[PDB]
């Protein structure tokens, strides 16, 4: 062929070996998406379960995914540092994750909301990015970062929508009322003025959602030395593992991580 | 925050300015997908119509897409060289396209196949890659490359699948019969033994599908010099331009390209 | 070997085919360097000749370099569009150019400055970066950018040092006198206050230095179609072409570029 | 300015934070270089000392370099994992190192070989590449890798050249004699045929050269929390710490590495 040379213009990006990979997916324009389909505000319970169902399905399909954290319209997936899925090609990994979440979300949406058929100009789409982390302390810090943001965003939105719904404020006056406020202020506004105790909100709303792969007889046998069938049996054992869902603090509960050593290696 | 530092590990890739971008999407495991959902062989008309509807819909949402070419389970989209969609971020462009094609396919499938509901373990997924080409001659050669591949593959599958169904050969025997064969050989087997004239095959099957944006009073006004209201008005005309579908040779027809100068600019 | 695996952590960057490469080199910490060895101000003639000699020697060794532009402590080298030097590896190209410039400068320094032996803590070091340009119009604009930069800095330095040297102003007052001034203002300060006609300054100081590869019987014979020994013959011809130095405008003189079409190929 | 837009085509590459950086420099065409200047064989003592001085000089100016290893025409530099030199820009780091090693070599060459002035067509040039390693075990294995290669090449070259110089063999007969041989065969050839004990070779020749930053009162005082003035005092101590040279096994002497914990941080 006189034309096949054009293949030489392609550039693959192989992610640095032996590094933890985070794949973060985030809904595109989900403010508009959540408005169009009338999410309950501040939080739509069934909408989050769709995200979570989507995430668990993806995670059960790919044994390299060790840990998942989701809230709002985002999910973060931790791939083990020795992951060889698609030879660690960033193009493959990211475009497959954004494709899967889109389609899994679309599938499960038709299950949970049969009376809200999707409009062609409002299908659920997601982006995806890969981030490399060379040390597990950065992994701890990454998920702590994301859970802290969930708290802040959930506290704000719960406060915001209660100002609108309980006090019959317009969005603009709700926003202005909150400018200049810290976490303790919003809590006071919610309790004293709206009659809502934030601490009594659902654990899923306050903490977000953790989906983690659970192993029973784990020994830190995973090493560079052993290979071939050992790797393949380990691939099989990872596939035949169980997914558990939690709504807990992972920021300050160090024992939670320590009792799950397969996350680091 | 003591954790937000983790954002610094993210790495963006901004694609070289003033260069043509090709985004190519390809179905994940569509051999299996086409078997599970019982596609007609060698070509399933409605399946391609699902593909064609998706790409046209995608292309109509994004005025920077000037031209698209599809055959089998793939589509290639040409972005104009001064495209600023998502600031030419490689991650954004590819994960958006893979997500869009995925959901549009899923949407249109339910239109064309109400009697074949999608199964959760067989959803339509796509990869997506971006390729840069610094000269339009490479764009012509790229699409020539894909259409030639369309010709070769359709001929093989038409010959292959007529050998199994008409001559009652097994898969191995048809493949074995074809080992060592060129186009004229395949063409003769079709004519003389199977009683099929390849030239009488649908133009879409032979040539594939081209979706192109058409302009009527085009002048090469596009230059770096004019700006402000000038550019946004042309952006408005690009969205309000028409997409026409063709099943024609674009390999050897220079006049086809020459009469479409907006492809170059 | 159980340790040779570490080679797999290396990541090569192959620069996009069929694109103009600009390699720009700029002296590291040459302000201090020029002070340490007591360079003449604003311009040291023998100092610029060391740079030009270094660059020309480099350019005569690497036939892929079609054009070079230098001023101050910098040189830019244009690599032909179809350059395959080190397989277009960015690492090889840039670290080779910075090393070459550093040692050639050092060699020629000992030629031009026998009376100023180099001190180990003040050796001439250079960085180097590669930049891709998909269209020759950006190459024209690149060199225009640099020559304008040359004019601006030379005009400033000539004005600055005439304020210090003729009018016995302090550096601080010379610097404060010029803040907020455009070219017409600086020209007058030189004329009315310093009695200097800027146009009588050396052409090299005003315009910088262009080193160009010159061909006599050139025909645009270059195409993908011609190959094998034909390309090898074109390499010998390119290696053995004459290098000419100019101190002229290249910003506005379109005819200068048009009569040297091999730069575009 | 209408031409300054061309700056936007530049692409920086910021190396992953919190990862070990190895920089390896290697002499360009040093086979030919060592012939032209008539190096002693197998090992030229003064030529290696030129290399060692360059590396030691380079290392004393840049305190982020924690360890260096050299043999033949190569030197590898370990940058501490929290290095912020040039904001971890790969282009700056590599072209600085290739320039520095080249000029330091040229400088020190004139000190050790006043009687062998450098010819302009045979100056000492170096390439340079940055390699990332996410775990310190790879740093150990890297230097193990390079020292093993030094052993292999020095044992071979010493045996080879003793065959040529002592037994008056031609290069070709010496080469075939060594084809198919492991270390014990080569050692025996040295012992039984040439009367040379390899173990009595200089430690520098056998092991290469290790340059290490030595700390006396080191505690792993480095953490993310400590910053500002703590870091500036720490930077000053690293700069004014002492460089010690060793010619010892670092492959298998774990206690050697273990007693130097500042290497991991
Ligand atoms: N010339 C050339 N063509 C290739 C190469 N690899 C794949 N192709 C062809 O390019 C077409 C596009 O398919 P791709 O999906 O991009 O190629 P692939 O083999 O699937 O590689 P990946 O999908 O990236 O894993 C296919 O029909 C392949 O036959 C290659 O390395 N060189
Ligand atoms: N009502 C409601 N809205 C939600 C819920 N989850 C996510 N959202 C919407 O998603 C948004 C999350 O913010 P972002 O993801 O950062 O912004 P975005 O609108 O998705 O736009 P992008 O930057 O393109 O991702 C919120 O502002 C909400 O409007 C939910 O459970 N209920
Ligand atoms: N520290 C820091 N955090 C940011 C920055 N930009 C966004 N974030 C936060 O990071 C979270 C992840 O959102 P992203 O999708 O990565 O950022 P974005 O603003 O949507 O920008 P995109 O990359 O185009 O999607 C957001 O909810 C923001 O709160 C930033 O520049 N610095
Ligand atoms: N029978 C039939 N098969 C089709 C049709 N369209 C696509 N296919 C199948 O899709 C395949 C296209 O090849 P690829 O996309 O390169 O292979 P793949 O199964 O998608 O595997 P990947 O490389 O992961 O994409 C063909 O082998 C066909 O079997 C169709 O209209 N009819
Ligand atoms: N295991 C392995 N070793 C290699 C490979 N390529 C080169 N090496 C070795 O690595 C050592 C370092 O040499 P380098 O200069 O980095 O590699 P090179 O052969 O010179 O190639 P370049 O320098 O990139 O032009 C050499 O002695 C090579 O034998 C490889 O692909 N795999
Ligand atoms: N006296 C004199 N000084 C010169 C001459 N050429 C270059 N220089 C000095 O070199 C400087 C070049 O500035 P830059 O290259 O932008 O900065 P730098 O000092 O080289 O250091 P970097 O920013 O790291 O590149 C000028 O300001 C002068 O001080 C010369 O011909 N004569
Ligand atoms: N328009 C524009 N000009 C720049 C920019 N950065 C630097 N310049 C100017 O362009 C000239 C090119 O020199 P550079 O070496 O690329 O600039 P620099 O600041 O030294 O950048 P680094 O050496 O990479 O740190 C410099 O003298 C700057 O004055 C920029 O981001 N935009
Ligand atoms: N006689 C002698 N030769 C040496 C000495 N040190 C290095 N060399 C020469 O340097 C060469 C090193 O090989 P390489 O670095 O892989 O190849 P190169 O000649 O530098 O060329 P490149 O691969 O482009 O870097 C050896 O083959 C030797 O001939 C020395 O101490 N004495
Ligand atoms: Mg976002
Ligand atoms: Mg979002
Ligand atoms: Mg979000
Ligand atoms: Mg493929
Ligand atoms: Mg496919
Ligand atoms: Mg395909
Ligand atoms: Mg600079
Ligand atoms: Mg400089
Ligand atoms: Mg400069
Ligand atoms: Mg090499
Ligand atoms: Mg070498
Ligand atoms: Mg070497």
* Whole-number Å distance between alpha carbons of B242 and B60: 9
Reading the block at residue B23, the tokens are: 């985004």
Question: Number of Cβ pairs closer than 8 Å across B and D?
Answer: 13
Pick the atom of ligand 6 nearest to C30's CA.
Answer: 20
SS (H, E, C) chain C: CCCHHHHHHCCCCECCCCCEEEEEEEECCHHHHHHHCCCCCCCCHHHHHHHHHHHHHHHHHCCCEEEEEEECCEEEEEECCCCCHHHHEHHHHHHHHHHHHHHHHHHHHHHHCCCCCCCCCCCCCEEEEEEEECCHHHHHHHHHHHHHHHHHHHHHHHHHHHHHHCCCCCHHHHHHHHCCCCHHHHHHHHHHHCCCCHHHCCHHHHHCEEEEEECCCCCCCCCCCCCCHHHHHHHHHHHCCEEEEECCCCCCCHHHHHCCHHHHC
Can you point out the beta strands (E) in chain A? 20-27, 65-71, 74-79, 126-133, 209-214, 242-246
Spatial CA neighbour of A16 closest among C199, D86, D133: D133
DSSP SS3 for A71: strand
Atom 32 in ligand 1: residue holding the nearest Cα: A7
Reading the block at residue D241, the tokens are: 């710490």
Across A105-122, b (16+ Cβ under 10 Å) vs e yields bbbbbbeeeeeeebeeee
* Whole-number Å distance between alpha carbons of A103 and A124: 8
Omega of the bond prior to C42 within 30 degrees of 0, cis? yes
Q: Which of A24, A26, A145 to mutate to test the pocket of ligand 3 (most atoms within 8 A of CB)?
A: A26
* Whole-number Å distance between alpha carbons of A38 and D13: 43
Omega of the bond prior to B74 within 30 degrees of 0, cis? no
B1 vs D contacts (CB less than 8 Å): none
Q: How far is CA D132 from the centre of its chain?
A: 16
C110 CA to centre of ligand 16 in angstroms = 21
What's the topology of domain B1-265? Alpha-Beta Plaits (3.30.70)
What ligand has the least distance to the C-alpha of D33? 8
CB atoms near residue A39 (< 10 Å): 18
C50 CA to centre of ligand 17 in angstroms = 15
Q: Answer whether A206's CB lies under 8 Å from A151's CB.
A: yes
Task: Inform me whether the C-beta atom of residue C19 falls under 8 Å from chain B C-beta atoms.
Answer: yes
* Whole-number Å distance between alpha carbons of A9 and B115: 42
The alpha carbons of chain D give a radius of gyration, in whole angstroms, of 21
* Whole-number Å distance between alpha carbons of C209 and C263: 17
Q: Answer whether D15's CB lies under 8 Å from D132's CB.
A: yes
Task: Inform me whether the C-beta atom of residue D225 falls under 8 Å from chain A C-beta atoms.
Answer: no
C7 lines ligand 5 (CB under 6 A): yes
* Whole-number Å distance between alpha carbons of D75 and D58: 11
Strands B74-79 and B20-27 turn out to be antiparallel
Task: Inform me whether the C-beta atom of residue C134 falls under 8 Å from chain A C-beta atoms.
Answer: no
DSSP alpha helix (H) spans, chain B = 30-36, 45-61, 90-112, 136-165, 171-178, 183-188, 203-207, 229-239, 254-258
* Whole-number Å distance between alpha carbons of A24 and A12: 20
DSSP SS3 for D214: strand
Distance from CA of C19 to the nearest CA of B (A): 6
C-alpha dihedral (D252, D255, D261, D262), degrees to nearest 10: -70
Residue B55 burial by CB count (10 A; 0-12/13-18/19+): exposed, middle or buried? buried
DSSP SS3 for D227: coil
Owner of token pair 């050998």:
B163
B74 CA to centre of ligand 14 in angstroms = 5
A126 vs B contacts (CB less than 8 Å): 95, 99
**Site residues for ligand 1, CB cut-off 6 Å:** A 4, 7; B 26, 149
CB contact under 8 Å between D19 and A138, yes or no, is: no
What are the Cα distances from residue A210, in Å, to A109, A159, A213, A246, C111?
20, 24, 10, 5, 70
DSSP SS3 for A12: coil
User: Which residues, at least 6 apart from D105, have a Cβ–Cβ distance to it below 8 Å?
Assistant: D50, D51, D54, D124, D126
Q: Answer whether D13's CB lies under 8 Å from D89's CB.
A: yes
Q: Answer whether B67's CB lies under 8 Å from B24's CB.
A: no
Residues ending a continuous segment of chain C before a break (C–N > 2.5 Å): none
* Whole-number Å distance between alpha carbons of B74 and B129: 12
Phi-psi category of residue A18: left, alpha or beta, with phi > 0 → left and psi -120 to 50 → alpha? left
Reading the block at residue C128, the tokens are: 């180097």
* Whole-number Å distance between alpha carbons of D61 and B182: 67
Pick the atom of ligand 2 nearest to A26's CA.
Answer: 25
Q: How many CA atoms lie within 13 A of B158 on its CB side?
A: 26
CB contact under 8 Å between B16 and D17, yes or no, is: no
Strands C74-79 and C65-71 turn out to be antiparallel
Phi-psi category of residue D163: left, alpha or beta, with phi > 0 → left and psi -120 to 50 → alpha? alpha
* Whole-number Å distance between alpha carbons of A133 and D134: 8
* Whole-number Å distance between alpha carbons of C112 and D90: 33
Experimental method reported for this structure = X-ray
Omega of the bond prior to D42 within 30 degrees of 0, cis? yes
Q: What are phi and psi of D38, to 5 degrees?
A: 50, 55
CB atoms near residue A41 (< 10 Å): 15
Q: What is the DSSP letter of B193?
A: I
* Whole-number Å distance between alpha carbons of A82 and A16: 10
Q: Answer whether C57's CB lies under 8 Å from C241's CB.
A: no
Reading the block at residue D70, the tokens are: 């050299």
Spatial CA neighbour of D210 closest among D175, D243, D164, D239: D243
Residue D154 burial by CB count (10 A; 0-12/13-18/19+): exposed, middle or buried? buried
* Secondary structure element (H or E) that encloses residue D229, with its range: helix D229-239
Task: Inform me whether the C-beta atom of residue C16 falls under 8 Å from chain A C-beta atoms.
Answer: yes
Reading the block at residue D129, the tokens are: 């590449």
* Secondary structure element (H or E) that encloses residue D144, with its range: helix D136-165
Q: What are phi and psi of B218, to 5 degrees?
A: -85, 130
* Structural domain spans, chain C: 1-265
* Sheet with A209-214, edge to edge strand ranges: A126-133, A20-27, A74-79, A65-71, A209-214, A242-246
* Whole-number Å distance between alpha carbons of C234 and C213: 14
* Sheet with B65-71, edge to edge strand ranges: B126-133, B20-27, B74-79, B65-71, B209-214, B242-246
User: Which residues, at least 6 apart from D247, have a Cβ–Cβ distance to it below 8 Å?
Assistant: D202, D203, D204, D206, D207, D208, D209, D210
CB contact under 8 Å between B8 and D17, yes or no, is: yes
Tell me which chain A residue has its CA closest to the CA of residue B61. A121
Resolution in A: 3.0
B129 vs A contacts (CB less than 8 Å): 10, 91, 95
CA pseudo-torsion sign A79, A83, A86, A88? positive
Distance from CA of A146 to the nearest CA of B (A): 9
Spatial CA neighbour of A214 closest among A186, A193, A237: A237
């Amino acid at each position: 062929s006189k034309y096949e040379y054009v293949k030489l213009f392609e550039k693959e990006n192989y992610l640095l070996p032996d590094t933890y990979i985070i794949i973060r997916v985030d809904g595109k324009g989900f403010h508009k998406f959540s408005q169009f389909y009338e999410f309950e505000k501040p939080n739509d319970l069934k909408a989050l379960q769709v995200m979570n169902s989507a995430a668990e399905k993806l995670m059960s399909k790919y044994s390299d995914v060790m840990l998942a954290y989701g809230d709002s319209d985002e999910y973060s997936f931790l791939l083990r540092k020795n992951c060889q899925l698609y030879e660690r090609r960033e193009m493959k990994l990211t475009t497959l994750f954004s494709s899967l979440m889109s389609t899994y979300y679309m599938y499960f949406w038709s299950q949970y909301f049969p009376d809200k058929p999707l409009h062609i100009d409002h299908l659920p789409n997601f982006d995806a990015r890969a981030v490399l982390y060379p040390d597990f302390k950065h992994i701890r810090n990454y998920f702590s970062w994301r859970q802290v943001d969930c708290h802040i965003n959930n506290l704000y939105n719960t406060t915001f929508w209660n100002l609108v719904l309980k006090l019959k404020m317009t969005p603009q006056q709700a926003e202005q009322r909150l400018m200049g406020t810290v976490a303790s202020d919003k809590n006071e506004i919610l309790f004293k003025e709206c009659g809502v105790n934030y601490n009594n909100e659902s654990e899923m709303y306050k903490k977000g959602t953790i989906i983690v792969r659970e192993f029973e007889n784990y020994e830190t046998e995973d090493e560079a030395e052993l290979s071939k069938r050992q790797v393949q049996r380990l691939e099989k054992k990872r596939k035949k593992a169980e997914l558990k869902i939690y709504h807990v603090d992972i920021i300050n509960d160090d024992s939670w991580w320590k009792s799950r050593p397969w996350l680091k290696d």
